[PDB]
């Protein structure tokens, strides 16, 4: 749950802060966190299940890092970041939906979807950052 | 250079060929005796150790078996053709062949012996080889002890040769060299289906010597740097140094009667320096050796050349202090004076580099953007074709960063220098003009550097680890100025022969590294599993480092060697070595019990026990097992030296079994047995508190004894109070010992695959880069 | 009946050296924020010089503790801990020599060396007590004989 | 004991003292020898015993 929230928070920060013309110093830490997320998620295969009418969806992560070369973010940087962020947002939204539609009588607080259960592994703890909600 | 000689003298791998079957046992004729001890007219064949040299003491026996493991690893071949071992079997009905000549000797001895059964002679007459030429297979009859058969069968079934063909030879070339359109590869031979080759063991570094072995990694990186220097191509058709100096003098407007900074701009401009800079840059990036920047702050041309160098080379390739000094000189000489900013007061040990502070402080977009790029220009760690590589930014590869740098320099030239005398601005402008009159040449040079770097990087087999090294390679900024000022339009790319030589040297070093790792790991694991607690393993690691051929072990302390031992101890053993050691572990007890020099122990009982009947001994006081007897371990007693228990047991006549590899006296005298001498050989233990001198008596009572009539004339079965914990030899069954060893009828093994590939280059004028454009484009 | 100054069990088995290693390994990863980078590198590499000898230092600690215990078994007078007027000056360069040059050759006191040390200690203690007895006897005799 | 030459070279290579600006470049590794190690061993154990 902390890893999923951190993924969503990183994506929201990327959407809000990676904008055309912005100083890189405004996003340096955000870019580092986003690249950490990319590194952690790369090479992992996820599946969001077919409970109810939810389609079964398979997610592969093979993204390259966001650049660190521009003093001010330009349109091309924003477009590449937008592509990556769109894929990640789709994944996170599907994971959230797959988790919301499941319940357990024994351990209802624990993750029920297999994607969130996988994200609860230690290898994803690196993605975790600010929890302010 | 001696380092280059050492690194290029490493041969690929000494290929081992088997000339005879590995044997630990041989048949031997022994006189046999009847149940009453009378000698039979017939003899009998028994399995006996070929070299019975087992030592005294269990620890020494385990040491002997470690040595035997080393011997078997030495004798294990890479491939085997049994027709080489095949010899004529003179008693074969079809005049066939057997392997090895030792088998032929056994067959002749058995066949010629009058005591041999006719069925065995029939069997020897049927022993011949079968050739299946269609499958390229041959089976040969061989006579082997079961352990010998196990070892030889493992050798036969686990050879290292694989089929070789033109496709394999072509794919042996790195994928990036084959994909390059600047090289044309050709072959003039069709390798037959019987061609063979041995793959190099290109496993990546299992010791991670780049992590916490800083001296060893410094040596490795120095060797890599020297080799890279040896293979980096030489610049051709460089601009004439005299003409370039004349042109620079005209551009700088040198004045005889005035002291001017611009004069120093001409310092150290020559073709030797340019070639040295080219080689140093490419070799340092290839070997990932840290570089040190040498420059004089009074030479502003050095600072402009350093601006270019920091633009093209990632800044982690330079030691931090030198990079900081160069950046501070650039900031305080070119940038801040140009923009009228107060001289930067930079603190030694600042977390930020001078360029980062300047980037935060500079309001000019072009200069600040170039500063940001230089700050964030890093290598990219990418696994290409299974090897970790440090890849340059694509803008460096295509040379656009040169355009960004030139934009920054042109912005600097347009500044007013408000607080400086006009001559200072003139000198800075003149240096920038010297650099900017060669903008296209600088783009070409950047592209050439990147292309040569990646082409030679395709030839690296071991992971390129980016870690700052203990020592650095000094790079004079005047050499960078020479390279910038003298580079022409001639494209130089690595020769295909140079690329193949570099790749072969890297492969040889990598394979030797892995093979020596395997040897050391196997030895260490075997010693641990053989419980050799008194063995100091420094010798193993010392031999390992010596065989790597690039370290001076005199300079390596013992602590580092034991750290290497600890790292090696965690690695799994290679499959062939591990299985050979498994065979040795399985069969070492039997091999030891086959020895005639030592016994497995001595049972001191204090009651009459009848001597056992065994055909090859007559009557013998042998114990097959230590059942019903308390055991004293002689190795533990010798290690601890506490003889209280054994002394008390010997003084109290308490039956016991002293267990451990012991030498024994063979005594055939019946009178000696009646006199009970075997029971008189244990008081020295109590007297001297030593057991290394213990030598129990092994009675061998039969008709060859002088006083055997006592046995025969009194219906008397000999008895003794002491027994020797020993095994009797296994009989030699000729039919059971016959095995059909199968191998390939014939093949040819090849060493250097690239010898079959002839490669050439396209015209350098038309050589292209990754972006499909020519590497150099200036007129 | 003899007072003895004994070490923590973690010193005797040499385990605490690991902790030391741990600590200084951390010191090798530290930033040293404002320190010049070359001096920082030298300090961290010296820290690693000591760190990478973890096995040798554990062996040295165990050897030192064992030798101390074995020789302390031969002490017959109470080991009283007092801050003395003068000290034995110990060079930290000698400590560096011991740390960086110790191998794996165990050296323990010889049985004859232990017996000789115990005999010397016993002789000194017995002479001390006997001379105390002689002095006390003579003083008491002089006082009881009224030898003012 | 570990070879004094080998350990001295190792320490010099790791410390890189010559490349520094330390006013005492030679004094850094002085006193690092087998005799000093034996003296330290004896001094420590003897001081603790006495």
From Swiss-Prot, chain A:
The N-terminus is blocked. It is found in: Virion. It comes from the Viruses. Residues 62-73 are annotated as: Interaction with the inner capsid protein VP2. Belongs to the rotavirus VP6 family. Intermediate capsid protein that self assembles to form an icosahedral capsid with a T=13 symmetry, which consists of 230 trimers of VP6, with channels at each of its five-fold vertices. This capsid constitutes the middle concentric layer of the viral mature particle. The innermost VP2 capsid and the intermediate VP6 capsid remain intact following cell entry to protect the dsRNA from degradation and to prevent unfavorable antiviral responses in the host cell during all the replication cycle of the virus. The VP6 trimer contains a zinc ion located at the center of the molecule. The zinc ion is not essential for either trimerization or transcription activity of the DLP. Zinc-depleted VP6 has an increased sensitivity to proteases. Homotrimer. Interacts with the inner capsid protein VP2. Interacts with the outer capsid glycoprotein VP7. Interacts with the outer capsid protein VP5*. This is Intermediate capsid protein VP6. It comes from Rotavirus A (strain RVA/Monkey/United States/RRV/1975/G3P5B[3]). The chain holds residues 1 to 133 of 397 of the full protein.
């Amino acid at each position: 749950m902390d890893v999923l929230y951190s993924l969503s928070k990183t994506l929201k920060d990327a959407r809000d802060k990676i904008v055309e013309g912005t100083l890189y110093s405004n996003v340096s830490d955000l870019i580092q966190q986003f690249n950490q997320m990319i590194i952690t998620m790369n090479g992992n295969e996820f599946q969001t299940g077919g409970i109810g009418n939810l389609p079964i969806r398979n997610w592969n992560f093979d993204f390259g890092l966001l650049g660190t070369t521009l003093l001010n973010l330009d349109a091309n940087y924003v477009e590449t970041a937008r592509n990556t962020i769109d894929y990640f947002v789709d994944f996170v939204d599907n994971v959230c939906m797959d988790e919301m539609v499941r319940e357990s009588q024994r351990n209802g607080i624990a993750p029920q979807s297999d994607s969130l259960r996988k994200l609860s592994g230690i290898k994803f703890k690196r993605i975790n950052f600010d929890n302010s909600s | 250079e001696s380092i280059l000689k050492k690194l290029e003298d490493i041969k690929p791998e000494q290929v081992k060929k088997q000339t005879k079957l590995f044997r630990i046992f041989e048949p031997r004729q022994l006189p046999v005796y009847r149940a009453n001890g009378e000698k039979e007219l017939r003899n009998r064949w028994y399995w006996k150790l070929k070299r019975d040299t087992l030592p005294d003491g269990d620890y020494d026996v385990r040491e002997y078996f470690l040595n035997l493991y080393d011997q078997v690893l030495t004798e294990m071949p890479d491939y085997l053709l049994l027709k080489d071992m095949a010899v004529e079997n003179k008693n074969s009905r079809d005049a066939g062949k057997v392997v090895d000549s030792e088998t032929a000797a056994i067959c002749d001895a058995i066949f010629q012996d009058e005591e041999t059964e006719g069925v065995v002679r029939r069997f020897i007459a049927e022993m011949r080889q079968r050739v299946q030429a269609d499958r390229n297979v041959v089976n040969y009859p061989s006579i082997l002890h079961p352990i010998d058969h196990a070892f030889n069968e493992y050798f036969l079934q686990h050879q290292l040769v694989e089929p070789l063909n033109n496709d394999i030879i072509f794919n042996y070339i790195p994928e990036r060299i084959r994909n390059d359109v600047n090289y044309i590869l050709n072959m003039d031979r069709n390798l037959p289906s019987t061609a063979r080759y041995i793959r190099p063991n290109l496993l990546q570094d299992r010791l991670n010597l780049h992590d916490n072995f800083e001296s060893l990694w410094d040596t490795i990186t120095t060797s890599n740097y020297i080799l890279a220097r040896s293979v980096v191509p030489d610049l051709k058709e460089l601009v004439s140094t005299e003409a370039q100096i004349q042109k620079m003098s005209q551009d700088l407007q040198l004045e005889a009667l005035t002291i001017q900074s611009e004069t120093q701009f001409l310092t150290g401009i020559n073709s030797q320096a340019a070639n040295d800079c080219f080689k140093t840059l490419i070799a340092a990036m290839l070997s990932q050796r840290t570089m040190s920047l040498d420059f004089v702050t009074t030479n502003y041309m050095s600072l402009i050349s350093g601006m270019w160098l920091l633009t093209v080379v990632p800044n982690d390739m330079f030691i931090r202090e030198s990079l900081v000094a160069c950046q501070l000189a650039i900031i305080n000489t070119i940038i801040y004076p140009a923009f009228g900013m107060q001289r930067m007061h930079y603190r030694n040990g600042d977390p930020q580099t001078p360029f980062q502070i300047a980037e935060q402080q500079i309001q000019n977009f072009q200069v600040a953007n170039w500063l940001h790029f230089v700050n964030n220009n890093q290598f990219r760690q990418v696994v290409i074709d299974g090897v970790l590589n440090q890849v340059l930014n694509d803008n460096i590869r295509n040379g656009h960063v040169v355009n960004q740098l030139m934009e920054a320099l042109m912005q600097l030239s347009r500044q007013q220098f408000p607080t400086m005398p006009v001559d200072y601005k003139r000198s800075i402008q003149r240096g920038i003009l010297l650099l900017s009159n060669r903008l296209g040449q600088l783009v070409d040079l950047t592209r050439l550097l990147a292309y040569n770097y990646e082409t030679l990087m395709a030839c690296i087999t071991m992971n390129m680890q980016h870690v700052q090294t203990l020592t650095t390679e000094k790079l004079q900024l005047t050499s960078v100025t020479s390279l910038c000022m003298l580079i022409g339009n001639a494209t130089v790319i690595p020769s295909p022969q140079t690329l193949f030589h570099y790749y072969n040297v890297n492969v040889n070093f990598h394979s030797n590294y892995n093979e020596r790792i395997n040897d050391a790991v196997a030895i260490i694991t075997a010693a641990n599993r053989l419980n050799l607690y008194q063995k100091k393993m420094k010798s193993i690691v010392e031999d390992f480092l010596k065989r790597l051929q690039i370290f001076d072990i005199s300079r390596v302390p013992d602590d580092q060697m034991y750290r290497l031992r600890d790292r090696l101890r965690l690695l799994p053993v290679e499959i062939r070595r591990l299985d050979i050691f498994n065979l040795i572990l399985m069969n070492m007890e039997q091999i030891e019990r086959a020895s005639d020099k030592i016994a497995q122990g001595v049972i001191i009982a204090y009651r009459d026990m009848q001597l056992e009947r065994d055909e090859m001994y007559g009557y013998v006081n042998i114990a097959r097992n230590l059942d019903g007897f308390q055991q004293i371990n002689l190795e533990e007693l010798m290690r601890t030296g506490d003889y209280a228990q054994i002394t008390n047991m010997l003084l109290n006549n308490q039956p016991v079994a002293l267990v451990g590899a012991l030498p024994f006296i063979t005594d055939s005298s019946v009178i000696s047995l009646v006199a009970k001498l075997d029971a008189t050989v244990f008081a020295q233990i109590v007297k001297l508190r030593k057991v290394d001198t213990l030598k129990p008596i092994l009675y061998k009572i039969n008709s060859d004894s002088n006083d055997f009539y006592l046995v025969a004339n009194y219906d008397w079965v000999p008895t003794s109070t002491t027994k020797v914990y020993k095994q009797i030899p296994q009989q030699f069954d000729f039919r059971a010992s016959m095995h059909m060893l199968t191998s390939n009828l014939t093949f040819t093994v090849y060493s250097d695959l690239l010898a079959f590939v002839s490669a050439d280059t396209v015209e350098p004028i038309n050589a292209v880069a990754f972006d499909n454009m020519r590497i150099m484009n200036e007129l």
